[PDB]
Design a protein around this nucleic acid. Structure first.
Lengths: 168, 30, 51, 106, 118, 196, 125, 163
RNA sequence: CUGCCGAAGGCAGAAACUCAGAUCAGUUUUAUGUGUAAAAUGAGAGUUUCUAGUGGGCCAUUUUUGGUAAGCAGAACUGGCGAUGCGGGAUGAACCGAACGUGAGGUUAAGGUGCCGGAAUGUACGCUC
RNA sequence: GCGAAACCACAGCCUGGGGAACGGGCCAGGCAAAAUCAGCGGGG
RNA sequence: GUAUAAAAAUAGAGGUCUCUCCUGUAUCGUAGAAGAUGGGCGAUGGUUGAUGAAACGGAAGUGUUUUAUUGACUUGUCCAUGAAAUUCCAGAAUCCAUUGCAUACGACUUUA
């Protein structure tokens, strides 16, 4: 699965730069090693800081402060496509930022044939205001009187003696 | 049943020839 | 000599031979007892729960 | 009429095999009622027997038995691996084996 | 200690089951592309040094005594100090008179005979 | 889920491929299988596409002696048998013996109409097909590919359902009598703490 | 018999380590997952998908997003416990559970008892 | 005449299953008395010195290997009121065959319980039964449970049922 | 008949003797600009001598120029093949793993778990008629 | 009634594939029931 | 234990306005020296065997019900006897003949 990490890093201090600036990024990766490499290439492509002359100063996994409250997360991401450039913004209702990112990765691999390396996440933000929600299906979930029967009921022990119920 | 006019399965010369000439196409566009 | 290789990790006697310290090792020691001091700088909490 | 059968039923499915290679030294057995590897844990080490009949009378009986023992589970669906004193014939595929309740561990 | 044979089927020359001009005795294939020499699947095995049996039991019969060929009473007497490890086997050309003379000599020696009842 | 000598499967509402695969695995396991009522097997895909599939199957024939050419079987039971045998190693003695353990029939003949008929959930269309999907019936594809015994089976099935309904009503009445006497008996409440 | 996914519908968990337990839906997270609670202490608050649970016919009034404390409070007030048991469905389930917990001596007790049940087979003529 | 090396394999007492305490009702999974239910008098070095009440199911004083025994959850039967120290391996020793030159219908007529079986062995068995029957008579259904026999049926899964 | 060593597109082996070495490396660092020079790791390193077989070609790789509807042609390196069986890709001279004494047990690679076929008609989220 | 010879690794069904040379042997399918007689010559 | 027969739908079914399903982990059966020998107490039942007669079942009727007469066993409940040294698992057709509606020879169609 995925875990959210904060990676703080800087280049090695020298005489030219006695106090190098400290760069922190919030990013998602299965483990710390992938997170550090994910961060290093991001730092290379944004600020041209080489991996050799830099160092990861702080690694910290982050847990969801309120995993028991359903939230709506809007995700700004950039995609590499045939043209090599695209921008998308999706909304997912889930109780955890990590799960929202996992759902985003599954949806994009399902729709646009996107892989982990092809997807770079710009921002995952929480949308508390109902009006700020843009997606109609999210608004459908947010309606106060939501109700619906179970979808995809679908139901070793081969050779059942009776016919299936698949109803109530 | 296949239900096709052209077989979906390919011959070994044909499948090998794609990697022969697909690579050359990348060489040409380079 | 040494007709068969015996793993000290499954054979207690062989571990006793090679390591004359396993008699008194005391792996599980009490460091925390109960008086735990919750210590995390408020600046660290802010930068952690930032963005 | 029903005061017996201290054993459970089983089928000899196939040899422990790859796609093109078979290893008759160990066989695959499907126990009736066992549908997972954790359930097969109970039947591990039990004595399985293959009972067949022949024409010639030896020791005044038509019945011959080949003994075996369940060794390890096979797959996720409850099938197990069995090793016999004599490897089962390939003509017994789908035949019925009798897995006894001893040596018991409970 | 017991007796263990690595293999019991003897190595037959390739195609000796197809031709009668080709004997059953093993001959090593010489063709560069022959399947037997290149050792493909489902092919008769080739005699390898790895097929040899344990030295402590090699040449020993199933009962553990190595067979020693004997033609006369002198050869019987040579197995006096080796009766626990060697067994006298009567030569096939020994006449009936020497056979009964030899077999009782071995029976008095306490030396096993592998073809006594003949 | 216990080894029976004969399993009678009422193929109504099942999917041809899924039921064939389950049956083909049981035959290799060594179980006699009777698949009754084969004119009710369901196949995914709309009827016109399935008929085009079958009519393409007729096209396969020898150019010398079509008598030796492919044998196109039109009965729904034979259609199921072809599906099953394609999932078996019938070129060997094991697969050939497995085929002998399968009896696929049209309707439910009298020797098997008085026996319990289990169903396979892994092949049932209701549990395995997304609602709103087009499908077809083998007993219908057969009639428009050459099968000529549809009316007789339907008539003999209406008779069978009438007789079975009468039998069930009689058995239900007897079961009601037994059920009424059940709570009247006392031990059914006296020491029923074991859950029975 | 509808079993709509409402806020406050009590449900029976059927897959996972909490199989056989009774819960109540507190919030509907999305199309395919929901948040449930229960007054019973052994079952913690968690988000569960609809494939691991079967909906019951009992609906209990419950404000959305309520904490476990008042969920127990409203559960005890409307008496959801033993209201689920009053249904014959729960009686069958607990009868199966007791029958599974049963043993060989008590199986012989059931032996004799149901033989005494078949004792009568008395039908009026 | 080579001298074999001294094997370092010493003999230590068996650690029997904790469920096989004396006084427990158990099923025989093998032997002539397969499926019978018996009361475990004591635990020998390897097997169980066990008997079913002979006045109930007719199972004499016999040893049974602990691997051929199904322990039940049936309530314990008191055995502390009878001595068990007279049951030893030498007591159960099957003397010695001393040659297979037998079995001409004379070793089998001179066998069975009429002969061979001493009147002393009958005395201990009756004494054990006399000290065991009052307990099983007091607690209900033990007499009938022990007289019955164990057998499997359709829908019975040994890996699921707990005895 | 068996065993051992074993190529080649000047080699492999044999014998005669150095030094217990800073003596070499299909290698990486350090310094100076793929060259050279002076730390890492591995290895016992070597020199003269003679004597079998071969000096071909196919496939792909990355560096260029000449090119055309269109492929194509000519170079250099790299490997695989050739002397190489085995697992998989339905089967295969060049695809993915893996270098082979006789066996027992365990675990995997590549590829797979509806049936043929050993292995989940597994779990979770979407797309498609 | 008499009585040969050429030829002969072994043989004998077709479809798609087996990089080629597709072949009869290999892969996946259709299929597949003794022993034979007279024709015609497609396939060597 | 060679035990278990409605049908149909699954965005609905069935039973007495009410109730049930939400799988057979269910139901029927299940002791006995492989099923022995007796004694009671309680019910007219169950297992039914043997025959003997009625009806039903034609899709491949592979059987179903109804009985009757009996001979049985009647664990329904409660008692007494024996088990063991199995002392630790194992009338037809054809040939010969005939026919010419047929025919290389077989075969066929007739007579005999």
């Amino acid at each position: 699965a995925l875990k959210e990490y904060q990676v703080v890093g800087r280049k090695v201090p020298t005489e030219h730069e006695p106090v190098p600036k400290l760069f922190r990024m919030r990013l998602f990766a299965p483990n710390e090693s992938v997170a550090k490499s994910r961060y290093w290439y991001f730092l290379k492509m944004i600020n041209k800081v080489k991996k050799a002359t830099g160092e990861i100063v702080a690694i910290n996994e982050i847990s969801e402060p309120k995993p028991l409250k359903a939230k709506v997360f809007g995700i700004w991401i950039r995609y590499d496509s045939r043209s090599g450039t695209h921008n998308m913004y999706k909304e997912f209702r889930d109780t955890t930022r990590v799960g929202a990112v996992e759902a985003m990765y599954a949806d994009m691999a399902a729709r646009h044939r996107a892989r982990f390396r092809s997807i770079r996440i710009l921002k995952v933000v929480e949308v508390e205001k109902k009006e700020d929600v843009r997606r109609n299906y999210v608004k459908q979930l947010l309606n106060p009187h939501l109700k619906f029967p179970l979808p995809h009921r679908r139901t070793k022990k081969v050779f059942a003696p009776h016919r299936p119920s698949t109803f109530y | 049943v296949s239900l096709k006019k052209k077989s979906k399965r390919r011959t070994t010369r044909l499948r090998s020839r794609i990697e022969k000439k697909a690579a050359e196409s990348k060489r040409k566009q380079k | 000599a040494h007709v068969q290789k015996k793993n000290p990790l499954k054979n207690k006697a062989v571990l006793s031979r090679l390591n004359p310290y396993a008699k008194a090792y005391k792996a599980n020691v009490k460091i925390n007892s109960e008086k735990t001091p919750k210590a995390a700088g408020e600046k660290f909490l802010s930068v952690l729960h930032e963005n | 009429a029903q005061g017996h059968r201290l054993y459970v039923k089983a089928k000899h499915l196939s040899f422990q095999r790859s796609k093109h290679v078979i290893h008759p030294g160990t066989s695959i057995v499907k126990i009736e009622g066992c549908d997972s590897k954790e359930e097969a844990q109970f039947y591990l080490g039990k004595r399985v027997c293959y009972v067949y009949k022949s024409s010639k009378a030896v020791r005044g009986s038509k019945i011959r038995v080949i003994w075996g023992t369940i060794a390890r589970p096979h797959g996720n669906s409850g099938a197990v691996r069995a090793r016999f004193v004599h490897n089962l014939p390939a003509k017994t595929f789908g035949s019925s084996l009798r897995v006894m309740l001893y040596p018991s561990n409970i | 200690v017991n007796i263990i044979k690595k293999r019991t089927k003897p190595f037959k020359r390739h195609q000796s089951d197809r031709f009668k001009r080709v004997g059953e005795s093993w001959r090593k294939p010489r063709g560069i592309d022959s399947c037997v020499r290149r050792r493909f699947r489902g092919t008769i095995s080739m005699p390898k040094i790895g097929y040899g049996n344990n030295k402590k039991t090699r040449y020993c019969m199933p009962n553990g005594l190595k067979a020693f060929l004997v033609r006369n009473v002198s050869d019987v007497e040579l197995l006096l100090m080796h009766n626990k490890t060697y067994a006298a086997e009567i030569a096939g050309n020994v006449s009936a008179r020497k056979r009964v003379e030899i077999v009782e000599k071995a029976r008095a020696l306490g030396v096993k005979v592998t073809n006594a009842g003949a | 889920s216990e080894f029976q000598k004969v399993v009678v499967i009422d193929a109504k509402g099942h999917l041809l491929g899924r039921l064939a695969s389950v049956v083909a695995k049981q035959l290799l396991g060594g179980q006699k299988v009777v698949v009754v009522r084969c004119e009710e097997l369901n196949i995914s895909g709309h009827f016109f596409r399935n008929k085009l599939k079958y009519l393409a199957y007729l096209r396969k024939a020898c150019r010398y002696n079509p008598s030796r050419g492919a044998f196109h079987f039109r009965a729904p039971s034979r259609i199921f048998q072809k599906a099953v045998r394609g999932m078996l190693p019938h070129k060997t003695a094991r697969g050939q013996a497995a085929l002998e353990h399968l009896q696929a029939v049209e309707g439910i003949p009298p020797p098997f109409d008085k026996q319990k008929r289990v169903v396979v959930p892994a092949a049932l269309r209701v549990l395995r097909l997304k609602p709103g999907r087009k499908y077809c019936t083998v007993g219908r594809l057969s009639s428009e590919v050459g099968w000529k015994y549809n009316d007789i089976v339907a008539k003999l099935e209406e008779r069978r359902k009438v007789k079975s309904a009468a039998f069930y009503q009689a058995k239900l009445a007897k079961q009601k009598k037994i059920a009424s006497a059940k709570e009247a008996s006392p031990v059914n409440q006296k020491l029923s703490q074991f859950g029975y | 018999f509808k079993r709509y996914v409402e806020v406050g519908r009590v449900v029976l968990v059927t897959k996972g380590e909490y199989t056989g337990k009774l819960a109540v839906i507190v919030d509907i997270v999305d199309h395919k997952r929901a948040l449930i609670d229960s007054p019973c202490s052994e079952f913690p608050r968690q988000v569960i998908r609809y494939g691991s649970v079967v909906l019951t016919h009992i609906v209990m009034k419950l404000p959305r997003g309520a904490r476990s404390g008042i969920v127990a409070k409203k559960w005890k007030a409307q008496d959801v416990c033993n209201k689920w048991a009053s249904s014959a469905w729960a009686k069958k389930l607990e009868a199966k559970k007791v029958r599974s917990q049963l043993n060989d001596f008590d199986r012989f007790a059931v032996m004799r008892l149901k033989k005494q049940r078949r004792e009568q087979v008395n039908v009026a003529v | 005449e080579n001298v074999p090396k001294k094997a370092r394999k010493a003999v230590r007492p068996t650690k029997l299953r904790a469920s096989l305490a004396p006084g427990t009702v158990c099923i025989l999974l093998a032997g002539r008395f397969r499926g019978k239910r018996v009361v475990v008098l004591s635990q020998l070095e390897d097997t169980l010195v066990v008997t079913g009440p002979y006045k109930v199911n007719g199972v004499p004083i016999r040893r049974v290997n602990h691997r051929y025994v199904i322990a039940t959850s049936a309530p314990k039967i008191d055995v502390s009121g009878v001595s068990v120290e007279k049951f030893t391996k030498a007591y159960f020793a099957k003397q010695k065959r001393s040659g297979p030159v037998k079995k001409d219908e004379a070793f089998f007529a001179e066998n069975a319980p009429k002969n061979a079986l001493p009147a002393e062995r009958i005395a201990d068995q009756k004494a054990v039964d006399a000290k065991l029957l009052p307990a099983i008579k007091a607690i209900p259904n033990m007499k009938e449970y022990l007289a019955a026999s164990f057998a499997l049926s359709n829908g019975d899964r040994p890996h699921l049922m707990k005895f």
